[PDB]
Design a protein around this motif. Structure first.
Motif, PDB file in Angstrom:
ATOM      1  N   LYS A 297       0.915  -1.139  -0.129  1.00 51.61           N
ATOM      2  CA  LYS A 297      -0.074  -0.039   0.148  1.00 51.61           C
ATOM      3  C   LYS A 297       0.924   1.250   0.007  1.00 51.61           C
ATOM      4  CE  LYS A 297      -1.781  -2.275  -0.792  1.00 51.61           C
ATOM      5  NZ  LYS A 297      -1.414  -3.519  -1.565  1.00 51.61           N
ATOM      6  N   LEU A 298       0.842   1.926   1.134  1.00 51.04           N
ATOM      7  CA  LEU A 298       1.840   3.067   1.279  1.00 51.04           C
ATOM      8  C   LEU A 298       3.382   2.745   1.060  1.00 51.04           C
ATOM      9  CD1 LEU A 298      -0.931   3.515   2.415  1.00 51.04           C
ATOM     10  CD2 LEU A 298       0.337   1.884   3.887  1.00 51.04           C
ATOM     11  N   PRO A 299       4.320   3.537   0.383  1.00 53.81           N
ATOM     12  CA  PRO A 299       5.478   3.311   0.337  1.00 53.81           C
ATOM     13  C   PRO A 299       6.308   3.889   1.402  1.00 53.81           C
ATOM     14  CG  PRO A 299       4.949   5.176  -1.113  1.00 53.81           C
ATOM     15  CD  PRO A 299       3.891   5.052  -0.273  1.00 53.81           C
ATOM     16  N   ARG A 300       6.682   5.273   1.812  1.00 55.48           N
ATOM     17  CA  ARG A 300       7.547   5.748   2.921  1.00 55.48           C
ATOM     18  C   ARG A 300       6.423   6.045   3.992  1.00 55.48           C
ATOM     19  NH1 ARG A 300      10.350   9.827   5.829  1.00 55.48           N
ATOM     20  NH2 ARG A 300       8.174  10.285   7.139  1.00 55.48           N
ATOM     21  N   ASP A 301       4.986   5.858   3.690  1.00 54.53           N
ATOM     22  CA  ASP A 301       4.194   6.267   4.758  1.00 54.53           C
ATOM     23  C   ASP A 301       3.954   5.012   5.834  1.00 54.53           C
ATOM     24  OD1 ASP A 301       2.219   7.622   6.342  1.00 54.53           O
ATOM     25  OD2 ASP A 301       2.059   9.020   4.681  1.00 54.53           O
TER      26      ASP A 301
ATOM     27  N   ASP B  29       3.586  13.264   2.121  1.00 48.77           N
ATOM     28  CA  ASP B  29       4.670  12.587   2.472  1.00 48.77           C
ATOM     29  C   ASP B  29       4.296  11.023   2.388  1.00 48.77           C
ATOM     30  OD1 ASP B  29       7.432  12.317   3.526  1.00 48.77           O
ATOM     31  OD2 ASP B  29       6.638  11.491   5.450  1.00 48.77           O
ATOM     32  N   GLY B  30       3.154  10.702   2.822  1.00 45.03           N
ATOM     33  CA  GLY B  30       2.738   9.529   2.690  1.00 45.03           C
ATOM     34  C   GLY B  30       2.761   8.754   1.254  1.00 45.03           C
ATOM     35  N   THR B  31       2.372   9.345   0.270  1.00 46.85           N
ATOM     36  CA  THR B  31       2.183   8.946  -0.951  1.00 46.85           C
ATOM     37  C   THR B  31       1.584   7.550  -1.041  1.00 46.85           C
ATOM     38  OG1 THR B  31       4.600   7.622  -1.255  1.00 46.85           O
ATOM     39  CG2 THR B  31       4.413  10.065  -1.600  1.00 46.85           C
ATOM     40  N   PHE B  32       0.372   7.326  -0.193  1.00 49.35           N
ATOM     41  CA  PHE B  32      -0.114   5.777  -0.170  1.00 49.35           C
ATOM     42  C   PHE B  32      -1.237   5.902  -1.340  1.00 49.35           C
ATOM     43  CE2 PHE B  32      -4.037   4.209   2.017  1.00 49.35           C
ATOM     44  CZ  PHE B  32      -3.792   2.926   1.492  1.00 49.35           C
TER      45      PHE B  32
END
Lengths: 50, 225, 259
Positions: free
Chosen positions: A46-50, B121-124
């Motif tokens: 799902k989310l990458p760096r989140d 920041d999330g980019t989800f």
């Protein structure tokens, strides 16, 4: 004071780098362990760096 | 610092119509040309200078300034002014009890920040379309309201105001708290709540801009110092 | 010092009340609001419709200068009455110029009489004149190519109420409102009148030298009751109106617009 900023920016870089290095190993480890509590490969990206 | 001629050019000397005046502004008034009140620039300028000086001083001790102007004509300009000197602002409607009720508003700010983080920041992505829309709307609302004051942390150490009668709630709050107020005060307005009154035309855009700019400069100077 | 006092009487000396001194520089344009600054207490909320010329599109960018008008101060916040009326004074000056040489020459093109005098239009504006003024003799511009080019030779003007009837073709040829209220009377004399304020039952078009007309809500259109006159016509605009009724006693001239 010219070199002061150089070392100043150096510390933070490696500090985050090392964290990221472990983070990379930890992220993979999270997915690695992610099997007894959610192995859904297509439902884990799902989310990458989140 | 700011000259008289420049002020005149801007349209500071112009005031409101004579029937809408406040008699507490009778000292700062000069006369009445064409049934419209003229502000005395001889009395205004020194006061303005003093105010500027005060602002500079505040800046010098790392003071937090808040720029308030919800007229909607000079909303764009006040924000710009704020950003030039990297200070905080309230260009849209002042939330009743922003400062007096900070502790509640600090939660709102936090929420806004969180929302922003989620957005950026999330980019989800991958969110239910209605829900996502709602979230976006919320973010927009927050940004409009508390965009300038999100990085303020605590309460400001001074409060610059573009209109005293229009932002009386803010002024009142400041008074309650004990924050110094730096209000631009046209002839219709009340100067009693204001600490450092600036007799001048709140309404005219160019004048407002001028008022902003000098203040910004002084803040910058203070920071530098 | 007295620098400021002298500066005040100086600035009194270098402005006047009407729209006379072309001073406001257009300092922001946005559809649909122009705004100037003629050395007044505030900036005008100008319509766009006082500034587009004769085919619909704007003519003046930033920095451009037209005077507006005055003598009305502060409705809450703001400053003016519109600069387009300004223009009327200029038109009056050109009409007056005739007197000097007994002949004002431009172009006048008058196709037909709403109320007994061909309509003449000069530049952007169009004016209505009494029936004789359109033609020097009995020539009649109905046989002339439609909306023809001549000039206007003046036949008649009413000097208080603004009606001017002017002379197309034939180049070779060269208390107060209410006593005699029988001029625009007889049943249906069409008039060109600017509306003033629409009072949710009315529109108040009133032009002919210190009178009051209504055109209330019943006619206005070809729908009766659901109309709301602010939606259907305008604010401040010169329109098609004629009398339909005069009481010279309880000064209520009751004009119409469904015609």
């Amino acid at each position: 004071l010219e070199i002061e900023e150089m070392q100043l920016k150096q510390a933070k870089k490696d500090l985050s780098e090392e964290l990221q290095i472990l983070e990379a190993g930890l992220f993979s480890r999270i997915r690695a362990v992610l099997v007894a509590g959610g192995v859904e490969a297509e439902k884990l990206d799902k989310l990458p760096r989140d | 610092t700011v000259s008289m001629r420049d002020m005149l050019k801007a349209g500071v000397h112009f005031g409101h119509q004579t029937r809408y005046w406040n008699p507490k502004m009778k000292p700062f008034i000069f006369g009445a040309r064409n049934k419209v009140h003229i502000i005395n620039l001889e009395k205004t300028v020194p006061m303005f200078n003093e105010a500027l000086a005060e602002l500079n001083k505040i800046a010098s001790r790392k003071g937090k300034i808040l720029f308030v102007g919800t007229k909607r004509a000079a909303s764009e300009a006040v924000k710009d002014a704020a950003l030039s000197c990297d200070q905080f602002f309230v260009n849209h409607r002042w939330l009743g009890g922003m400062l007096t009720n900070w502790k509640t508003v600090r939660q709102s700010i936090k929420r806004l920040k969180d929302l922003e983080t989620q957005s950026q920041d999330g980019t989800f992505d991958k969110l239910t379309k209605k829900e996502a829309l709602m979230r976006t709307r919320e973010l927009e609302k927050l940004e409009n309201s508390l965009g300038g004051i999100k990085d303020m942390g605590g309460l400001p150490d001074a409060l610059f105001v573009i209109d005293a009668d229009h932002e009386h709630i803010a002024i009142k709050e400041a008074n309650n708290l004990g924050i110094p107020v730096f209000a631009i005060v046209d002839t219709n307005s009340d100067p009693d709540g204001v600490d450092f009154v600036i007799p001048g035309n709140d309404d005219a855009i160019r004048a407002v801009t001028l008022y902003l700019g000098a203040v910004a400069a002084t803040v910058r100077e203070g920071r530098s110092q | 010092e007295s620098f400021a006092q002298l500066f005040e009487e100086s600035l009194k000396e270098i402005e006047t009340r009407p729209g006379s001194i072309v001073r406001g520089v257009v300092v922001a344009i946005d559809k649909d609001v122009v705004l100037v600054d003629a050395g007044l207490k505030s900036e005008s909320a100008i319509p766009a419709e006082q500034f587009k010329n004769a085919q619909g599109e704007l003519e003046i960018q930033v920095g451009d200068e037209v005077d507006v008008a005055l003598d009305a101060v502060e409705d809450g916040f703001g400053e003016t009455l519109l600069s387009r009326e300004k223009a009327k004074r200029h038109e009056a000056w050109i009409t007056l110029e005739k007197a000097y040489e007994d002949a004002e020459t431009v172009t006048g093109v008058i196709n037909g009489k709403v109320k007994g005098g061909f309509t003449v239009e000069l530049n952007g504006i169009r004016a209505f004149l009494p029936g004789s003024l359109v033609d020097v003799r009995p020539v009649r511009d109905t046989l002339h190519l439609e909306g023809k080019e001549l000039e206007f030779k003046v036949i008649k003007l009413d000097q208080k109420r603004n009606n001017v009837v002017v002379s197309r073709r034939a180049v070779i040829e060269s208390e107060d409102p209410w006593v005699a209220i029988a001029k625009r009377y007889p049943e249906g004399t069409k008039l060109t009148g600017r509306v003033t304020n629409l009072t949710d039952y009315g529109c108040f078009v009133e032009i002919e030298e210190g009178v009051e007309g209504l055109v209330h809500v019943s006619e206005m259109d070809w729908t009766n009751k659901n109309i709301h006159p602010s939606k259907v016509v305008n604010v401040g605009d010169v329109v098609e109106v004629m009398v339909l009724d005069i009481d010279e006693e309880r000064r209520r001239i009751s004009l119409g617009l469904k015609q």
